[PDB]
Amino acid sequence: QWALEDFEIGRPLGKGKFGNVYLAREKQSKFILALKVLFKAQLEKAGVEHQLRREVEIQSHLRHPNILRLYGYFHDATRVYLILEYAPLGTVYRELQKLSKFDEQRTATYITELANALSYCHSKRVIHRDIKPENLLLGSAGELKIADFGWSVHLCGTLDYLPPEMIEGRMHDEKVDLWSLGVLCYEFLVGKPPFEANTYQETYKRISRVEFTFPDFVTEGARDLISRLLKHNPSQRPMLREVLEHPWITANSSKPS
């Protein structure tokens, strides 16, 4: 059992189409968290009510330090309420806007944390998560959090992290997450994703043909990891544990492996 009157509400942390996210506090415990408010009107008007309920079941049964936790959920008259972990330091995207680009040590550490979280996801038969920087949150210690369990709260950015097999409407694997990592790692180091262009058409062209280059300052190890991940055909992409044990990752990250 949970009800709305069990929570004090503070400010909106994000406003969205399918719903909003609020800072909140359970009244008895005084414990800070977040309350996602989704409108049933707009959930049935995309036929996803039982696509949402699957994600609720997915996220509630995931316990991982780098996955945004789902404590519980309830419904009133017309809205679904998700009781969610609050991440005090905001989106990885914002951090990247401030710093422009990340250094090798933070990048590799973030990539470690994602890879662990994703390996865990793959172990629970969860073969894909979205991990664009806007959908990755930061905990109180700066530790990275996969937050995307549907219906998020945020130039050609839509295409930018999609692998060829998806843009091309072919079948897509657990290897999609590897392409995403490739894209993130590049973005962290460079401050731009690898296939950015002024038109969707051009971005497609570059994704499709895997055409990208590195600025001078990117080191050969970083270049090696990224080139290993950005492969057109997904079966050539390395396994998640080849990422956790890559020379550049172990050399530069703090979180062990």
Ligand SMILES: CCC(=O)Nc1ccc(C(=O)Nc2ccc(Nc3ncc4c(n3)N(C)c3ccc(C)cc3C(=O)N4C)cc2)cc1
């Ligand atoms: C000049 C511009 C600038 O830097 N200006 C600025 C101004 C203000 C701020 C700022 O206080 N931003 C901030 C700080 C903390 C959070 N935490 C958070 N914790 C948990 C969240 C969640 N957000 N929301 C919205 C999600 C967002 C995405 C996804 C996929 C999932 C979630 C989600 O499910 N939950 C539960 C959010 C926002 C930062 C920067």
